[PDB]
Symmetry: D3
Subunit: 266 residues, 6 copies
């Protein structure tokens, strides 16, 4: 439906695919269709084995994603609200589980599902003028896209609570100071400084073992949600997966022959 565009970058960006929300008419809000195309796209990248890094961004300057579409919501019966929100929550959770490194490039507004979707990404970067927050309580509801879970895990319980309790919106610098994002940027002429940084950062990921990068992501993600000892067991099992791989050997041979490894993800 054009609102979502999945691009597979070429040349020096080979290995990086991009997901760009494009829906100005609705401030990139999460409409019933946008999460289907989104869900559709995500399920596809799951299996896509040639991908090495996924960037999520907006093609509408000044806006990343305003969250759920309040308009469509007012037309939903109480017995329909829950199911729809849960759908939002699940598509975002699917994003948090994408096989490869993920980067959310915030160049504009990002509220509710907008920020929540970015919270599902591994790393977040934003212009200093970008605005983001979870303002659900002001509407007598709560973040329904995992924000009640990922925000506290990302910036700490106390700060996440203050933000949700006050439904306060932060700008790039504030977000960076609280830890919400790793890199804060200075918006440029075309309003894509964040996306730009994301591209650069992603390139730093391309030269590594595709198989290593994935199990490493698994070890980190799964292990953080269980006791450390079990977490250690998970690392061992992820590491085991890198042993019978060619890249493991192509890497040891790359340094012998003093040259950039030619990993294949094998």
């Amino acid at each position: 439906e054009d609102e979502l565009r999945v691009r597979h970058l070429e040349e020096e960006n080979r290995g990086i695919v991009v997901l760009g929300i494009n829906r100005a008419y609705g401030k990139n809000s999460l409409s019933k269709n946008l999460i289907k195309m989104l869900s559709k796209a995500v399920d596809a990248l799951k299996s896509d084995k040639k991908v090495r890094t996924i960037i999520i961004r907006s093609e509408v300057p000044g806006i990343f994603c305003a969250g759920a579409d309040l308009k469509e919501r007012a037309k939903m019966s109480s017995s329909e609200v829950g199911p729809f929100v849960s759908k939002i929550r699940a598509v975002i959770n699917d994003i948090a589980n994408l096989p490869v490194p993920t980067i959310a490039a915030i160049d504009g507004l990002a509220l509710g599902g907008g920020l929540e979707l970015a919270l599902a990404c591994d790393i977040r970067v934003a212009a200093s003028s970008a605005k983001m927050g979870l303002v659900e309580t002001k509407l007598a509801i709560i973040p329904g896209g995992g924000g009640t879970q990922r925000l506290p895990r990302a910036i700490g319980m106390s700060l996440a609570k203050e933000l949700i309790f006050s439904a306060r919106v932060l700008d790039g610098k504030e977000a960076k100071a609280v830890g919400l994002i790793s890199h804060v940027l200075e918006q440029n002429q075309e309003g894509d400084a964040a996306y730009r940084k994301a591209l650069d950062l992603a390139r730093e990921f391309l030269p590594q073992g595709p198989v290593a990068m994935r199990v490493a992501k698994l070890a980190i993600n799964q292990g953080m949600e269980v006791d450390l000892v079990t977490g250690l067991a998970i690392e061992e099992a992820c590491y085991a997966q890198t042993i019978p791989t060619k890249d493991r050997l192509e890497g040891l041979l790359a340094f012998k022959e003093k040259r950039p490894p030619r990993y294949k993800g094998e």
Copy 2:
């Protein structure tokens, strides 16, 4: 009495202040203060109008110096364990208070005192405030949840060092390690943190009471289990806001470009 409870009014209505007032014992956690604090906390649990609670001291220069040492000296070994557990219990009840909580540290917060603050959702302290857990200097350990909440709030490393060294920090340092959310210059009235607390509390009053309560649950409960279960807890908590009158007011208020009128239902 040694514990004051007051429901603020007007532009502060919806804020309940728990004020410790035992200048005599430096606000130490005595058997009585603990008994009263417990009643206070359980009552508030049921209160339907409270939208935020502030825990502060009504004695300048002191927040709470932890457990009363004069009493401990008169306790038999078979009494100590149960007593400290009674303390750990109340602190945890305070940690589970329904509405948002804010500790206003304008004085010395040691052991039980600091642990009480750690049980609150947010902490604000004056620059000159001194806080810390120095139990190891006494051959014991934090028994009010400190060994648990401290590492959770500032991280294992920083929390361990503080416990191992039994180091006391000031407001500036606590802000640096993330022990508190807001630090500020103590005013001449000796209630800087308290004032700031009030300004921050007011920022909570406008939100849907139901939403605020289950939002706290989703957070407090979600953090202590795996993310997937947390997401389920989030769904269950959201579910409760859907069939509320406030959720509609929220949408309507938006549609009529006006401030919402939430009633907690």
Copy 3:
């Protein structure tokens, strides 16, 4: 052997035992023998009852521990790498479980197992010029010394992922900003500034009650890996252990007589 030295300091520093890696010829890499010696050293202190605090450092300037010895690994078959690496993960985890406070003095390079060895310590102190990181992904593998579990817990999932995905190395300054270390300082002409500071901090731990210090480490370490309610029960059971000790009485007396306590560790 001179490979791993164990210094039981005394008088003024009594209670402090230091572990110094001394494999200058191999950048202090975690060789087969070093592991075996390190393991024995740990297990030894694991029960030593005099100890009050352990410090892990290098006696080779500019180098802390380069991590796994890339050389021995070269002479390993795929059916052996796993077991070996798991052996490392086990010793490093043994270090994490030492009964007393542990400090890692970093006055030089800390990569892979080396940085992981430090993460297993309670406190990390380094010189702003010291470099550290987990570069496994560049070689097509992942941190096998517990790094996938300890790096996200110490500096947060997002940054931890960025450092591992990009295989970036940091200096003390950056490590301080990311929260990787708790103390950073300028290197001295002796190249042992971290050690100096580490030793100073260990001294602050000496006056405290020994039994109380150990159960406090158990409570914190253990409670951090289960729901908070259980941690509270764990705190309770750890505290109960200080109740009938002589030290606790000595503590209340010292306070009464307004004097310094004489803790015997019982």
Copy 4:
């Protein structure tokens, strides 16, 4: 035609049956049956009327022999991992269906077939039905969630023995070790388990739909976390039934001494 999804009527109205019909190849979890199955299970997650789901086979003697060995030999190791995970995935969705699920074992249930059965809430089998996880005899392990659900259903010890030995049990034995709740003697038609599963589902139909679904959520989620968190999950689940019309109907019906008639809301 390979996958029949029927919405029964009459006294069984509210029961949805999913029958695997591929005698062609002993109902093996092939690339196709999987896609169709996933489509089916997904569809059911949103099925507003269903009150209980029964999974059975329409090929006498065979339930589901598990992963398609024929296909497995055609895929490179680079394709194995994914497909096996796809299985584990669809079976996991079956485990989280909103309503009560019943697996009727009237035939051979091996590997994925038995793992599919463990994803259901309740299992019933004919005494002559053979079931098991024999993965080890093929140098692999159960990849349909078997290593997790079997230990959970029958306990560690027994589950390990069954998996270490790759031993196949019969209805009676399966019933002996707890692998199933209901065993009965097979019949001429070869559908005794299915028939029993129907009479079990009918017992479920009369209860309030909402409470039933949230009851399942509370049970499934609470079991995978500490008891305390689980009690909070319970509370949040219970809360969702308070504001329902069915809840008042229940009390209304009790007052009038009549059977309640729940509509979901």
Copy 5:
């Protein structure tokens, strides 16, 4: 008043404390008042020092507890229900946490709260003709006294689901068969068959060391709800508490002098 009575058995039962429910006109239902009285009694006993075992039973023949009072519920605005139910769930959990061993003597009907209270006890004993179950789904609600939690734990998930789903009611015999109870016996001419058996069982616990018995309960209850490794640490910290006890040496001494132990709870 006497709607709940606490008896401190003496003679050969000294140490045993019977908690009986005497509220016949409401089938020992959990009303505001009984819940309150019950909570105080429970709280009190929680700090009682001479208790060795607590037995919970009904003073009314043919009835244990029919759960919440439908009467009060009918007269209860929705915003009042959630709070009142959590209060039953909380008290039942305090019961689950009592210091010493607890036994539920089911001599009559045990429905909802009643059965849930019984599940909060460590051991359940019931007359063969006793009726027990959770029928909440028949009322469009779910168990709210812990049932969705304690039933699956006690008898397994599959069996727990089927009982809840069909809202089936079992008898003493059928309860023993599914593991809902540990001991089942034919009723007597007094109607206190389960109680008499519970007394005989309670007596078996008396000769043991009070402290050990307690920390043992802590270790079992707490370690069960967390990973085993952490569970093993909780056992360590609980064992530790028996080491400095005088009773520990009594057991040893009593053994040497080949004679019965005389423990005094310290």
Copy 6:
């Protein structure tokens, strides 16, 4: 000399037996016996050829009575705990052995004895054999993992009663409460369980050793975390058997209608 490590052969090739020979002490866990047990179990972890381990007593009528009371009464406060932790640490190492473990209870198994058995994957015991955890009668509590393994093995309620009453059971009773998986009648040789253990152990020899190892891993680890993470571990483990030569052999043997020839790798 008091602990016999023996690698059987011919028909039993692959099985190794841990023999506790120490009648001059009822096989009590002495600081020295533990020493050896730890070193033997530490080496078995690296043994490539081992496919199954069997812990047995070479002393008839006695399996293991636990820690040696005598040495204990010669230990000061400070030594007890450290020592008991050594028992718990080894028994735990045992529980973590890479391959299947079968405990042959042909005689009295108490305290550390039963706890040593609880650490094995499967427990086989004579009908006359006696086993229990009687620590509470000694004013202490199970210190080899019993407060944890027993409750997970036979249920919380039963485990509580066995530990609270500190009663002893006989093979028959152990069977009905799930404490053991197999019960026999003791023979003239006084080694009934052992024999069963071997027969049972023979059923394991053929399966893929790699699959076997990662199967125990998945089961042991998944049972202690949430189900969802449990499935992840299973995937990660299934992953390890994919690139092996054994898996291919499995598909080949089947194809060529012949028994599988597995050999790790």
